[PDB]
C-alpha cells in the first residue's frame, strides 16, 4: 500500500484510526499514530488487507505509537489533502497562533491556529499531559493523523477532540473547538524514527 499521512487504517479488524506520519527504523519501515489506537502486536491493514502491527505504543500519559510495517509497503513523504497531497519537508515545533492542518479519515484535510500547548486532556480512560491543542476541527477516526504546516512541516499527531454527537466539531463554532495533537519529536526520539521527507 502506499503509506500517506492521513489516510484509513484499521486495527484488530475491528477500529478505524489515521496514519500520522511515513518513518524508518533502520532498514524497518513503519508510520508514526496516536497511541489509543492500538496496542503491543495489532494488526494494522489498509484496504482490509493487512500491512504491518504495532510496535510501542504509549497511552494514557503520553499518545503515541508506531506501526512496523513489511517491506512490500511504500513510503511516501506525503500528507493527504483531498486529491492532492502536501510533502512533508521536515518537522518543527509550532507556537501558539502558528496556522496548521490537520489530516484525517473522517473529517478529511482541515485547517486553523494553534491555540494553546501543554494542555493535559482529562480523557475517560486517563489523562494525558503535554499536548498542542488547535481550533481546526475534527471527528471519531480522525485520531492518529497527521499535524502539519501548508509549508510541509510535520508538528504532531491527533490524540482528541470535544467530539459532538454528530461525531465531530466542525458544527459549532471555531472558538468553542478544542482539537488536541501530541508533538512529533518526543515520538521519533523515543523509537529511534527517522520521518520520511521529500
Known amino acids: 500500500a502506499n503509506i500517506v499521512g492521513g489516510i484509513e487504517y484499521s486495527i484488530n479488524n475491528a477500529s478505524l484510526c489515521s496514519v500520522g506520519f511515513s518513518v524508518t527504523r533502520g532498514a524497518t519501515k513503519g508510520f508514526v499514530t ?25 497511552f494514557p500519559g503520553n499518545d503515541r505509537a508506531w506501526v512496523s510495517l513489511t517491506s512490500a509497503q511504500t513510503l511516501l513523504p506525503r500528507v493527504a489533502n483531498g486529491s492532492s497531497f502536501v510533502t512533508v519537508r521536515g518537522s518543527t515545533e509550532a507556537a501558539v497562533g502558528a496556522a496548521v492542518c490537520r489530516s484525517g479519515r473522517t473529517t478529511g484535510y482541515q485547517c486553523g491556529t494553534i491555540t494553546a500547548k501543554n494542555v493535559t486532556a482529562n480523557y475517560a480512560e486517563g489523562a494525558v499531559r503535554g499536548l498542542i491543542q488547535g481550533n481546526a476541527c475534527m471527528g471519531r477516526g480522525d485520531s492518529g493523523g497527521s499535524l502539519i504546516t501548508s509549508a510541509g512541516q510535520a508538528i504532531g499527531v491527533m490524540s482528541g477532540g470535544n467530539v459532538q454527537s454528530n461525531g465531530n466539531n466542525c458544527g459549532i463554532p471555531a472558538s ?23
Open 34 to 58: 496516536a497511541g489509543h489506537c492500538g496496542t503491543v502486536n495489532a494488526t494494522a491493514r489498509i484496504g482490509g488487507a493487512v500491512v504491518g502491527t504495532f510496535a510501542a505504543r504509549v
Open 176 to 198: 468553542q473547538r478544542s482539537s488536541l495533537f501530541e508533538r512529533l519529536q518526543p515520538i521519533l526520539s523515543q523509537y529511534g524514527l527517522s520521518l520520511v521527507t521529500g
